């Protein structure tokens, strides 16, 4: 055939892939973390938005740190051979490098490690997107005019 | 050939390293509202990094906090695209 280029990911597999949305709104009292009012709005916007991109969306609410890790692990071991990509949206309290289960924090690196090129071979070479609505610290941006 | 085990990840963070991230209890988070709007308007038109750059500008320009507490009033936010992708990503195909 004619000349070919391959500067863009193949996104015409039979499925776009999973969109996992972890929406943490209510935290165990002993953590001292406040309820994240308005996050259900986010979860619904994301669900609809990625539905229209033809992602298989799964919304999960109020997961402990243990449930987050098991869910990432389980999801990483599914058959992704027919899926173009993988998306994970995390909505929660956080700090630099960290997001919070309802009962305490999870290292971001621990979540993403399940999908490493060598540990999730069905996703090797395929885009793995992590979208993170959470603190990365406590600095505030005062902005500048114009 | 091998590829790096860290290749082909994209981390779309809502805020710069070290910073608070803002969420509106009524409208949702600045970043997520902006991300969905820009995906809706441009997913059939722009490559993903260019979509996320529109999200950066939307959050940067259209939002500013309002607080009775002077420490938290009038603050701004810039999201943070971290890309280890090796190709362009279009959500549509030909």
């Amino acid at each position: 055939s004619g000349i070919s280029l391959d500067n863009s990911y193949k996104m015409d597999y039979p499925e776009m892939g999973l969109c996992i949305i972890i929406n943490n709104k209510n935290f165990h009292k002993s953590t001292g973390m406040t309820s994240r009012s308005g996050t259900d709005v986010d979860a619904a916007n994301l669900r609809e938005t990625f539905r229209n991109l033809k992602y298989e969306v799964r919304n999960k609410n109020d997961l402990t740190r243990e449930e987050i890790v098991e869910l990432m692990r389980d999801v990483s071991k599914e058959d992704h051979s027919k899926r173009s990509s993988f998306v994970c949206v995390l909505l929660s309290h956080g700090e630099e490098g960290i997001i919070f289960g309802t009962n305490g924090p999870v290292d971001l690196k621990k979540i993403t490690n399940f999908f490493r090129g060598d540990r999730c071979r069905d996703l090797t070479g395929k885009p793995k997107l992590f979208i993170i609505q959470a603190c990365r610290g406590t600095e505030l941006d005062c902005g500048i005019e114009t | 050939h091998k590829i790096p085990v860290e290749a082909d990840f994209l981390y779309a963070y809502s805020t710069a390293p070290g910073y608070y991230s803002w969420r509106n209890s009524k409208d949702g988070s600045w970043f997520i509202q902006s991300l969905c709007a820009m995906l809706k308007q441009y997913a059939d038109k722009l490559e993903f990094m260019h979509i996320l750059t529109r999200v950066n500008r939307k959050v940067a320009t259209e939002f500013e906090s309002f607080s009775f507490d002077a420490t938290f009033h009038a603050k701004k936010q810039i999201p943070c695209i971290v890309s280890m992708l090796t190709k362009e990503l279009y959500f549509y195909h030909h």
Binding site: G38, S92, H93, Q133, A134 | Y20, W22, R23, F72
Partner: peptide
């Protein structure tokens, strides 16, 4: 407006 609240922070996360």
């Amino acid at each position: 407006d609240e922070v996360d």
